[PDB]
Amino acid sequence: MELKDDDFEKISELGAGNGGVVFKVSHKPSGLVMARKLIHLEIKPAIRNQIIRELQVLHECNSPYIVGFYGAFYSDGEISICMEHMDGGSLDQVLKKAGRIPEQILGKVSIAVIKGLTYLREKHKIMHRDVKPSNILVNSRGEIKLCDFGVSGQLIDSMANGTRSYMSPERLQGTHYSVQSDIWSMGLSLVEMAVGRYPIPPPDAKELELMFPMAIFELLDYIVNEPPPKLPSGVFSLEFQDFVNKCLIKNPAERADLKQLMVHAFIKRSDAEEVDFAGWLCSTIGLN
Amino acid sequence: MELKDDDFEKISELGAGNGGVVFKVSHKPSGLVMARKLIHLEIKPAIRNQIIRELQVLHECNSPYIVGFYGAFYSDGEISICMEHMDGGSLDQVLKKAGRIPEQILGKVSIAVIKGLTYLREKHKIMHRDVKPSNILVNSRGEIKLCDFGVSGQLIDSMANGTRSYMSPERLQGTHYSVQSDIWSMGLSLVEMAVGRYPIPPPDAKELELMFPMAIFELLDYIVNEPPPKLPSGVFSLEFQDFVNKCLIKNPAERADLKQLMVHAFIKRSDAEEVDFAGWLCSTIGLN
Numbered sequence: 001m002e003l004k005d006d007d008f009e010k011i012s013e014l015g016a017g018n019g020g021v022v023f024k025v026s027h028k029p030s031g032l033v034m035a036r037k038l039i040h041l042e043i044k045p046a047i048r049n050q051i052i053r054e055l056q057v058l059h060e061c062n063s064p065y066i067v068g069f070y071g072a073f074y075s076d077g078e079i080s081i082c083m084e085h086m087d088g089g090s091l092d093q094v095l096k097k098a099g100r101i102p103e104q105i106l107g108k109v110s111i112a113v114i115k116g117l118t119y120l121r122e123k124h125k126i127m128h129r130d131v132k133p134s135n136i137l138v139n140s141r142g143e144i145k146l147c148d149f150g151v152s153g154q155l156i157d158s159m160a161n162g163t164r165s166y167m168s169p170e171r172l173q174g175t176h177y178s179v180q181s182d183i184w185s186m187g188l189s190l191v192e193m194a195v196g197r198y199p200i201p202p203p204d205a206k207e208l209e210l211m212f213p214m215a216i217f218e219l220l221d222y223i224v225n226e227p228p229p230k231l232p233s234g235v236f237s238l239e240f241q242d243f244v245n246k247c248l249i250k251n252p253a254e255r256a257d258l259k260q261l262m263v264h265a266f267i268k269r270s271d272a273e274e275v276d277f278a279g280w281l282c283s284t285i286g287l288n
Numbered sequence: 289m290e291l292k293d294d295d296f297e298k299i300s301e302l303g304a305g306n307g308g309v310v311f312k313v314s315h316k317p318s319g320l321v322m323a324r325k326l327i328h329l330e331i332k333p334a335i336r337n338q339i340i341r342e343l344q345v346l347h348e349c350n351s352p353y354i355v356g357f358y359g360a361f362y363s364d365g366e367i368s369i370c371m372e373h374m375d376g377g378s379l380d381q382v383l384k385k386a387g388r389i390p391e392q393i394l395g396k397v398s399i400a401v402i403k404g405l406t407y408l409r410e411k412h413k414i415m416h417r418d419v420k421p422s423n424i425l426v427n428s429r430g431e432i433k434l435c436d437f438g439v440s441g442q443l444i445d446s447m448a449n450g451t452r453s454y455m456s457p458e459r460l461q462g463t464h465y466s467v468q469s470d471i472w473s474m475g476l477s478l479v480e481m482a483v484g485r486y487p488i489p490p491p492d493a494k495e496l497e498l499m500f501p502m503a504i505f506e507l508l509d510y511i512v513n514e515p516p517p518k519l520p521s522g523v524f525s526l527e528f529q530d531f532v533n534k535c536l537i538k539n540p541a542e543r544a545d546l547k548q549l550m551v552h553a554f555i556k557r558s559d560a561e562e563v564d565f566a567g568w569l570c571s572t573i574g575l576n
């Protein structure tokens with residue numbers, strides 16, 4: 001059935017970021033609990049209609065590694081995107097509660113990200129464009145899924161316009177970037193989650209012992225002109241270290257792609273491992 | 289009297305930016321039309337109360353060059369700042385309608401900015417921190433006034449977190465910036481308004497004849513490492529050119545301060561000039 005503004009009842013606020021709020025809502029005709037994202041854009045009616053039209057391809061984005069979509073519509077000054085409610089929230093929220101995410105859990109995260117990115121590329125011919133811990137959602141069933149990807153060319157354009165960045169060196173410097181940019185973001189996101197803080201500027205000797213704000217030109221100059229961040233040695237396996245190293249190669253053509261990462265030792269190893277992600281999640285965030 | 293959420297009725301939406309919406313509202317007990325800015329922050333109750341408390345100093349910020357303040361309060365997830373409604377809107381909106389602002393009008397703009405900044409420094413011991421055309425508001429009485437300055441230390445902190453920047457080279461590179469940073473922003477804002485587009489990267493020969501998007505590392509690298517932008521010669525007086533040159537000196541200690549700019553030839557000249565700013569405004573934006 002068609003979604004409209006009327007038919008929704010607000011339960012609570014799940015969070016907000018830059019240009020969006022997301023509510024936990026009841027869709028009253030169906031009884032279904034959803035996450036309803038509201039994007040406020042001051043744009044002409046014809047552009048707004050193209051955006052809505054282009055979000056309908058989300059009905060066709062069906063994957064265990066992609067957040068379910070129910071519908072998208074416009075109502076007073078706001079574009080609504082209605083999606084599956086993910087009761088574990090995002091990986092940035094889980095990281096705050098966890099302090100630090102176990103390497104084994106990050107093995108399952110990595111698999112799901114690579115698989116979601118692969119699905120988007122293979123089946124929809126698109127890059128994600130916004131990989132970072134807050135765009136990876138989890139639930140009490142142990143599901144790990146991507147949201148907030150570039151499905152709509154016009155919405156990409158209209159959104160265009162930090163104390164931290166997940167954008168690749170090539171994307172920071174110009175228009176010459178593509179699917180490889182997403183690999184860098186994934187790599188950086190994994191280092192942050194492994195280590196328990198945004199990893200740029202690198203943890204010094206003292207910080208590493210103790211666990212185991214930058215101006216924005218300073219930060220972006222670092223990303224482009226300094227060597228990429230790196231997992232600590234000792235605390236993480238050489239497979240994981242090599243995995244994030246291959247994600248964080250500055251030249252995007254020598255950086256590993258999804259095809260290579262899918263057969264990387266670390267993935268093979270994680271693929272094999274018996275991990276109770278669902279139980280880990282619930283304990284750390286207090287679901288059950 | 290005290291302002292509360294109840295007592296307000298929404299008339300229309302004046303605009304929105306990064307972290308705020310502003311509505312044209314009727315305060316029903318008084319009959320007064322106001323601009324009510326809503327800032328949504330996910331912050332603990334004790335911080336939120338410090339913010340509200342620190343915004344009360346706006347009751348004490350009374351100046352012909354500062355947007356009037358009526359009150360600030362918190363209600364469901366939102367900090368409200370209620371201010372004087374400026375029926376001419378901001379200088380970014382007027383620039384869109386005008387294409388380009390006459391040098392004589394920019395003389396009056398400059399005077400009002402310098403005087404507002406001086407008032408804030410002299411009487412309140414604060415820097416503005418966010419000078420740019422959208423934070424300079426105008427009205428049909430010919431008034432030009434500053435809003436959106438750093439009155440609250442805690443709100444500054446809580447807000448911390450572009451395809452364009454008005455931030456000085458020193459502020460882009462670190463913590464070593466202060467009131468001089470505002471002078472750079474003013475200078476850059478005046479060049480944008482004079483010329484009719486954000487002036488970085490400089491207009492080439494062909495663009496200048498014809499009137500008379502950058503990656504964000506590219507843009508900020510330009511601001512820090514390349515020579516400052518400059519007014520075209522020919523179309524603008526040497527006084528104006530020298531004025532913006534003195535604002536846009538990269539070293540903030542040799543950059544002119546407010547004291548010097550107040551006695552700069554351009555100001556003396558503009559101070560003397562008979563300009564119908566109110567009539568110019570209304571014609572260009574269609575008020576009367």
Ligand SMILES: Nc1ncnc2c1ncn2[C@@H]1O[C@H](COP(=O)(O)OP(=O)(O)OP(=O)(O)O)[C@@H](O)[C@H]1O
Pocket residue numbers: 014015016017018019020021022035067083084085086087089090092093134135137147148
């Ligand atoms: N489908 C969902 N289910 C559960 N929680 C969600 C869902 N979508 C979003 N959220 C929560 O809402 C928050 C805000 O989402 P939003 O995408 O607007 O901002 P963001 O992604 O954190 O950051 P930014 O806007 O800066 O990119 C997310 O951090 C996430 O915690």
Ligand SMILES: Nc1ncnc2c1ncn2[C@@H]1O[C@H](COP(=O)(O)OP(=O)(O)OP(=O)(O)O)[C@@H](O)[C@H]1O
Pocket residue numbers: 302303304305306307308309310323355371372373374375377378380381422423425435436
């Ligand atoms: N007191 C006011 N009277 C009339 N219009 C206003 C007033 N305050 C704000 N506005 C309008 O509301 C718009 C949005 O304000 P806001 O400060 O939220 O964003 P901004 O200043 O444009 O940009 P940003 O948030 O990116 O700094 C402004 O451009 C201005 O046009």
Ligand SMILES: O=C(NOCCO)c1cc(COCCO)c(F)c(F)c1Nc1ccc(I)cc1F
Pocket residue numbers: 017018019020021037039055058066067068069081083128129130146147148149150151152153155156159
């Ligand atoms: O919301 C989005 N970004 O979040 C920024 C805080 O609003 C978003 C952005 C774009 C365009 O920008 C692409 C990145 O440059 C887009 F096309 C979307 F479809 C988006 N949303 C979205 C996508 C898939 C699902 I399943 C659920 C969603 F909500």
Ligand SMILES: O=C(NOCCO)c1cc(COCCO)c(F)c(F)c1Nc1ccc(I)cc1F
Pocket residue numbers: 305306307308309325327343346354355356357369371416417418434435436437438439440441443444447
């Ligand atoms: O709103 C503000 N910024 O705008 C960004 C879109 O929300 C704003 C920000 C700060 C803190 O940040 C300082 C700059 O770094 C502050 F202290 C304010 F009082 C603000 N508002 C404000 C100030 C004076 C008047 I008169 C009316 C106002 F609305």
Ligand SMILES: [Mg+2]
Pocket residue numbers: 017134135148
């Ligand atoms: Mg998001």
Ligand SMILES: [Mg+2]
Pocket residue numbers: 305422423436
């Ligand atoms: Mg503003």
